[PDB]
Design a protein that fits this description.
The structure is a homodimer of 197-residue chains. By secondary structure, chain A is of the alpha+beta class. Chain A has helices spanning 14-29, 60-71, 87-104, 113-123, 137-150, 159-163, 165-177, 179-182, 188-196; strands at 2-8, 33-39, 47-52, 55-58. Chain A has nine helices and four strands, in the order βαβββαααααααα. In chain A, helix 1 links the parallel strand 1 (2-8) and strand 2 (33-39). The first copy, chain A, starts with a strand and ends with a helix. The interface between A and B is medium-sized, with 27 and 27 residues. Chains A, B: This is glutamate--tRNA ligase.
Chain lengths: 197, 197
Amino acid sequence: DSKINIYYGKNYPFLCRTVFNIYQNNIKKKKEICVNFINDKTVVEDIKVEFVRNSVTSSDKIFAINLDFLLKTNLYYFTSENINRNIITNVFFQAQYNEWIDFLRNKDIEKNIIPICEHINKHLYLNTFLSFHYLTLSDIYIYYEMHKYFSGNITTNLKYPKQYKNINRWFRLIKALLHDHVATDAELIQNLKVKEK
Amino acid sequence: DSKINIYYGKNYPFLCRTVFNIYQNNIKKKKEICVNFINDKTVVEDIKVEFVRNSVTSSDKIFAINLDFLLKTNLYYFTSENINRNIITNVFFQAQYNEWIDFLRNKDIEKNIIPICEHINKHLYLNTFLSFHYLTLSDIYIYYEMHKYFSGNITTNLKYPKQYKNINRWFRLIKALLHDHVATDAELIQNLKVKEK
């Protein structure tokens, strides 16, 4: 019933696309909401979101928080007295997601790939997921930022899985967890290949 | 029962303090949550939040979103079929708050005060509040960013209320709305005077 248009240019919104795919798969397991991803040649690098019943300017890493809130995908806003599902525990995770945003904010990832990996590989030494013990928006966000370096598509980037085993182990975990949601997209998959050339 | 410690240095967290004050006043109208604001000499300009039952690094403008979520202060997460209180309407507002964050992100406000006022004064030409028709976190955030220029404490800044009537009208509105929550604080008030010298 509800229509939301996400206009993208150079940078395809992998995070928002993945969140929306998970939302669609959840409904199959169960008025729905339609999210459209439109290749706009006038958009440069950010995301432009139009609400159809008014538009806003956002980015993939930030508006995916809104989608999780709207679509109840349980990646940023916890829809689940569990071990780590308290309200204050939820708030604590949200500040941790903002830390990953600040860690990569205004930072050339290609230029700082080694220092970024030097932290994530040590962070994953004693952690299975980036936050707590389950898949969260932090895992998926960092997954697409690391994808070009750890997917293996670029043969010149095979040194990163070799040098950073912990990231490689976690990356293979997130890939399997997201397989049922993104492997059959064929548009997310295509844009991954285009971005990786 | 629950304890949250906010450690601040040079920059006092006016937004988080105001949100917490509103939360305390709401309970009086009605297990509660205690938020402590601690002057830490080792903090430079950001905010450091400790959860007592683990710490995170955040900022006043960003962690106040978490406080509104936790304290249900109805400024970012709408706790109220109203005119502009739909879930999608709520999501739309959140992206608008992020726009104000991006508009002042990594921007010297003193250096860009005129261009900032050139937009806000025109935005307030046909709008009473920054978003929709009621007080929101956008109003309070911009209120403290504009406070030194429109409070009248600094006599050299009296030209801004003169030149920008629309901002002055809105600023006087937000001041009255926040009067019952911040006027008796005497620590928020003191830090305003210290920041304004």
